[PDB]
Ligand binder design. Sequence first.
Ligand SMILES: [Zn+2]
Length: 157
Amino acid sequence: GSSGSSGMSVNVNRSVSDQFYRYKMPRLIAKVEGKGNGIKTVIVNMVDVAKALNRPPTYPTKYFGCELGAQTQFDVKNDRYIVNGSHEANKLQDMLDGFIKKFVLCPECENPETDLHVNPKKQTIGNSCKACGYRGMLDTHHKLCTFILKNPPENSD
Ligand SMILES: [Zn+2]
């Protein structure tokens, strides 16, 4: 029984420097091959991190591409996600931070106990927080929105 744990997780947010935060998320992993001759980043821990955030990897995965300004591959069959370009986990984490700071967490209470809503008629995205009581329409993204609309989030029973 090695001294300690096997896998360590970081705080839901990269702004807190304490060990009191209950909710935790597994540090995403980014893989890279070659250099220039077809170098691309593959977020192996794309599906994992998602589940933890109670959200699909399609939300974050897509983001990376936007910010990075590159293309991305989506394969549900093998749940494999690829992001054109070279980016180390360290960086990817930061880039995602933002998303996990507004989408996931609440801009009022910063609680991961929030959700998102999609309107096919109004064609506008909006979140609703219960912890504090915040509501509104998320700034219509550039491409993401287009994807979200075409394919709404998964419902629960
Ligand atoms: Zn809130």
